[PDB]
Symmetry: D2
Subunit: 172 residues, 4 copies
Amino acid sequence: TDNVTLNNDKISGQAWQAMRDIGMSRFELFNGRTQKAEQLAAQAEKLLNDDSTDWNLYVKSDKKAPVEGDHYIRINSSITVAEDYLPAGQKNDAINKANQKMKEGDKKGTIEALKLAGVSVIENQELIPLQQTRKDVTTALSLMNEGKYYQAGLLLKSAQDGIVVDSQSVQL
Amino acid sequence: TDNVTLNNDKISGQAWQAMRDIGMSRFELFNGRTQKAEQLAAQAEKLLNDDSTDWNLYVKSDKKAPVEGDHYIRINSSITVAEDYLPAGQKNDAINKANQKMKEGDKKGTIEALKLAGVSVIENQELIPLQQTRKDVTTALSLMNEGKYYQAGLLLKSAQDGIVVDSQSVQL
Amino acid sequence: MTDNVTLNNDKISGQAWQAMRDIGMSRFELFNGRTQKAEQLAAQAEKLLNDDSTDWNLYVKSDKKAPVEGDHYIRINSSITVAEDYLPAGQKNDAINKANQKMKEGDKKGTIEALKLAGVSVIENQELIPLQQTRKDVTTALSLMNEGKYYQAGLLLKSAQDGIVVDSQSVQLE
Amino acid sequence: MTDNVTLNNDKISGQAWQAMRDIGMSRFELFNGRTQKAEQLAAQAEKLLNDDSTDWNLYVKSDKKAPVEGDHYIRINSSITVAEDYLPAGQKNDAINKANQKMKEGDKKGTIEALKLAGVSVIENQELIPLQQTRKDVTTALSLMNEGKYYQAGLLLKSAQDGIVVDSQSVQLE
C-alpha cells in the first residue's frame, strides 16, 4: 500500500517492497538458494516496472538523480525530533497543546505547537533512483541466468547503496 | 513469513512486521492521524504477543538482553562482504568456484571458495528485546488512550532504538 | 579540526567536526563516571562551536532550511558514494585508467566525466549540523553538568548528535 | 588518538580510531583530485595501525571471531544507548538524582543500578575493526596509489571501512 509524507506526497509501497526483495535476493545467493534468489529478484523487477503504477506520483522533483534523465522516488518516510531545553512545566503545557492538535488532524498546528515545546521535527525521506535501480535489477537477473551469482550480488548491493535519505525540516 | 540465518536459525517475520508497524504508528502521530496510529500500534501488539507463535524459535541464546529475564530475538539478517586484493585472474577462478557452490546449495563450500577469492562474509543479525518491546508497545497504547500522543511517540521510538545489529563472521 | 573542501570547493568546518566528536565522547564519559572529563570535553566543543574569530558563513549550506528560525546548516564532513553499473571490463578498465589520470591531474570535472564512461556515478555525502541549535544544546548541557544533572546533560548531548543530517547529492560541478 | 576505556575498563585504541578517520579522508581526497594528500593520509593510517611500539593485545575483543584466520577485532570507539521505560515521573526523577550522584562519585556499578530503578537500560556500543585485515587493506591501497591506480585504491579504503562492526551489549559490570 502507499503512504504519504507530511506535505502529502505519495510514497511508493511497491518500490519499497522491491528494495526489501532485492536485499533478500542477495542474501539467498549467499544462503545457497539461487532459485529463490532469482524469484526474489524477479518480484522486484515486476514491482519496479509495473505499467499500472503511476511512477510520477512518487518522484521528488527538486533532487537531481545520478544518471541523466532519471529521477529519485520516495519509498519511505520517518520522523526525527530534536528537543531543546525548556522548563518541564512550560514544556508540558506546550505538549498538551500539540497533542490536541494531533487529535484534530491539524498538521501545521502540530508543528507549531511542538516548536513552542522546544521540539523540532525532521522528515527523513528515503529515496531511490528509479531507472538506475531498474537497470541494476535487470542486469542482476541477466547475470543470474549466466550463473554469475557473486556478480549478481554486486549489482543487487549497488541498487541498495543507491538509496539516499533526504532529511528536511517540516514546512507546511 | 519466516526467513533463516546462514546457520539456519529462524527469523521472526511477525516481529519484523511489528517493528515496521511501530515506526509507521509513530509517523502517523505526527501526521495527525491518531486513530491510524493506534491501529498500527495495535497490529504490532498482536504480532508481538501471538500465542500461536513459538517465540523461542527466534531467540539468540548467547546474547544477554538489557532487562532481566528478557531475550533478544532475530528479526532480519543481511550480508556484508569485504574483499581483499587478489590478482583479477586468480580471483575470477575462485569466484567461479564459489558460484558453482552456490548453485549446489553448499553453504560452507561457498564461504570456503569465497575465502580463496579474498572475500570474507559478515552476517548482520538485527535483534530486538522481545519483552521490552512488548512493554513499550503496550504502554504506548495506554498513553494513546489517555490522549498523550507525543509521549506515546517517545515509547514507540524507544522500541525502535532497542534494535541492535549483531555482526558476526560466518562459522558453519 | 583543520578545514577541508567539498568537490565544489565549499569550505568544511573542521572545528565543528571536532566539537561533534567531543560531544559524543563527553556523553560517554558521563556514564563512565568521569563527569569532570565530560565537562572539559563539552567545554571544548562549546568553544570550538562559538569561536567568534571563525567566519561561520564560509560553512553554511544556503539551500537547506534549518529547523529553528534564523539558524543555518553548516558542513562538517564530506564523503563519497560510488555506484557501479555492470560494464564490459575492457571498456570499464579503459575508462577507469582515464579517470585515474584525471585524478592525478587534479581535474575534478574530468574525473566525473571519465567515471561516467566507466558506468560509475558519484554521490557526495555532506554531513551537516544546525549551528545555533547545536551551540544551544552544548551550552545548556554544560549548565546541566554544573548543576550536577548529568543524565539530563547526556540527553542534550544526544539531541545535538541527532541533529546531524547527511545531504547526499549527485555530483554536478559545471 | 589517545586511548580511552570501555565501561568495563578495557582499553580502546585511539590510534586505530584516527587511522579509520584518515582512511575516510584519504578516499575523499582521491575523488577530490588531491592524490598526494590522499597518499599522506593513507600513509598516516598505515603507520598508526602498524606501530610496533603499541601493544595491540590491549585492544583485542577476545570473544569475537575475526573473519580472517589469525586476525582479531580491536576496540576503536565506545558509545552509549539508553532505553527509557515509562515511569511515574516522581519515581523516575528520584532515581535519576541517585544515578547523578553515582556518576559524580565515579561509581559505575552504582550508576547502572540507579538507572535501572529509573526504568533506564544502558547499552554500550563498541566499534571494532579486524586489525590485520585493515592493515592489509591500507598497505595495498598505498601500493595502488603508488601505481597511479587511484579508483582501485578507493575500493580498498572503502572495504576497510566496511569492516567496521558495532558490538552493542547490555552493560554488566559485576
